[PDB]
Write a protein that binds this ligand. Structure first.
Ligand SMILES: CCCCCCCCCCCC(=O)SCCNC(=O)CCNC(=O)[C@H](O)C(C)(C)COP(=O)(O)OP(=O)(O)OC[C@H]1O[C@@H](n2cnc3c(N)ncnc32)[C@H](O)[C@@H]1OP(=O)(O)O
Ligand SMILES: CCCCCCCCCCCC(=O)O
Lengths: 337, 339
């Protein structure tokens, strides 16, 4: 476990435009009626009633940059203190260079600042925290930024075009339906060596389990995402269960002994199936997919930032970060407030 | 100075893409555009110094090429996939935005449910980044073995760039901006890293230094079908950045150029490379180049060259090997291997 790693600052950005599921259903209504769809899958089943979109021409790096500036302020440090910047977003503007280098350019990092991207679907932010934690413990750097901006504008625009086409089949509809559960947003975290920030929350790290045989289940680019919803739910929960059992071992976790559960946000049935598996008090599980949908790897730190801004947390509170992503990969870690 | 301790290279391999595409063939297609634009010099063969590059079949994905390299690297290290505790994929090429290419490679190989996997992306320096991340886990003893894998696909950028540049209405500016795309190449590499205790006679990786100039992030921008590049400015600002990195390399690695045995350098063109070696007083006999026949294989370039050096019998026990590169960003990293 990490002994000397802390969270110096934390921030999130909510995207400014609301697209409700009611509004999407009115667009999709003529398709529903020719396919004989009678059910509201988004609202009544998924539990997603709205999501947020950016203005046009907002790139991932722009969103991440906004979040990074807020996080530095939350941490009371200047950019010149940053020795490492990692971008963990799924959304990316180019293959080359790293989105991190674009964010770093915007921010004005020093010539000593190491930067690169990590990609791992919705788990990448936790991955990013661990890579930074290891560099901090080793004394390579004092402060690190982990940043993540997500943009779903184009995937809504293109998916809605496809779904409204007179040639669309129910097979294609059900297979791209998951794209209509995603949302825009951004997050950023400042991590630091603990001797520099004695009042800050401590990050202990945690455990990782994987099921890489299921890598075909959810495949996506900026304009299109194809998903096997049923199997992904079933196998995703199986891996989460396996990882949580492994966590109870090495982290000493017992459900009653935890104050907050910061979980990846994908759907109401997904969530309820997991909490029921372990008898977790749903009150302890903050949910935002209702109005924000799935913000990918930024989801977990967004919720954690919202919890912080709420003035919820108390010193000594044990917070379980429960991350997962298409892969499948699952990582569960502990933060002590 | 925080150099890595007891981190070793247990296995190493490269894959050469099978189909040769010559610059003579490319020039043939481009000739009408050259003539219309008044270009009278062979800018590929004579200026950039690239005579050939390799391509895959159309149906080969980044993960496919990385998987080929990985299996060969495991054989080299004489271990099974069940030993691997970490797999990092470092390629610029990728199958999708999500999931990671690493998880596709990991699924192909059959890694255990304890294996940690993800992609790292950082233009042409990412393989060194992957080695560094693996090394930190290995040094702590969190894992015993790691795989760092990298497959590059340039098929689509060749196809689309050549169509655009052979268009009746291509502008001189668009032509110049995209020309560097025709110096790219296909190929793959993978390395098995291990705790030194398990492989007492294997080479040692020490890590090294990194310096950056992220205000130059616009100079080279790439996607699956297009790459736009300011070649002139990349040369000038690259050497500048490499100069800072060498000063740092003397501080933490204690480097003196005459004392190093091999320089394994990421390469973007023949004149760029000669400028680099001239700038820092490097013995050219200690610099192997595959650019003339393979072009620029991005982040796989460094380990592909290292693997070829091993296969040529040019590396012996105790040889001090410098891994050097400038990557779009800009970033520059310099690390040492002791064979
Ligand atoms: C560019 C990147 C940006 C970047 C943005 C950042 C994100 C990047 C990261 C990638 C994000 C991903 O991995 S997204 C992958 C995770 N998200 C998802 O899988 C979305 C799916 N969400 C869900 O809540 C679920 O799987 C449901 C709602 C689809 C099914 O729930 P569940 O309870 O089985 O439902 P079950 O009873 O079958 O369903 C009963 C009823 O729902 C209907 N139903 C069930 N499934 C479907 C379906 N797939 N499509 C249509 N309808 C369906 C049935 O017909 C039936 O209707 P009837 O009999 O009443 O008529
Ligand atoms: C821990 C929550 C349990 C339900 C989550 C199942 C995993 C769904 C996979 C989608 C992850 C992603 O958005 O990349």
């Amino acid at each position: 476990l990490f002994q000397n790693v802390s969270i110096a600052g934390l921030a999130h950005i909510d995207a400014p435009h609301t697209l409700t599921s009611k509004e999407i259903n009115e667009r999709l209504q003529p398709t529903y009626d020719r396919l004989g769809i009678k059910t509201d899958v988004l609202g009544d089943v998924a539990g997603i009633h709205a999501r947020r979109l950016w203005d046009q021409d907002v790139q991932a790096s722009d969103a991440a940059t906004q979040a990074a500036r807020k996080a530095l302020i939350d941490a009371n440090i200047g950019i010149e203190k940053i020795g490492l910047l990692i971008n963990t977003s799924v959304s990316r503007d180019y293959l080359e260079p790293s989105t991190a280098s674009i964010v770093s350019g915007n921010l004005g990092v020093s010539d000593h600042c190491m930067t690169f991207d990590v990609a791992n679907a919705s788990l990448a932010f936790i991955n990013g925290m661990d890579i930074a934690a290891r560099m901090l413990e080793r004394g390579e750097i004092d402060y690190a930024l982990v940043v993540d901006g997500e943009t779903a504008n184009l995937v809504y625009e293109k998916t809605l075009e496809r779904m409204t086409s007179p040639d669309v089949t129910e097979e294609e509809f059900r297979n791209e339906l998951a794209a209509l559960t995603l949302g825009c947003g951004a997050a950023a975290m400042v991590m630091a060596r603990s001797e520099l920030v004695p009042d800050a929350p401590r990050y202990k790290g945690g455990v990782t389990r994987s099921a890489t045989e299921w890598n075909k289940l959810c495949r996506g680019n900026l304009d299109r995402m194809v998903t096997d919803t049923r199997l992904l739910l079933i196998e995703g929960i199986k891996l989460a269960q396996k990882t949580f059992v492994a966590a109870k071992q090495v982290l000493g976790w017992a459900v009653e002994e935890l104050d907050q559960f910061v979980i990846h946000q994908v759907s109401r049935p997904h969530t309820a199936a997991f909490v029921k598996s372990f008898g977790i008090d749903p009150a302890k599980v903050m949910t935002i997919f209702g109005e924000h949908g799935n913000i990918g790897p930024a989801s977990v730190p967004i919720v954690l930032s919202k919890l912080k801004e709420l003035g919820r947390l108390k010193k000594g509170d044990r917070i379980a970060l429960l991350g997962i992503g298409s892969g499948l990969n699952c990582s569960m870690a502990e933060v002590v407030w």
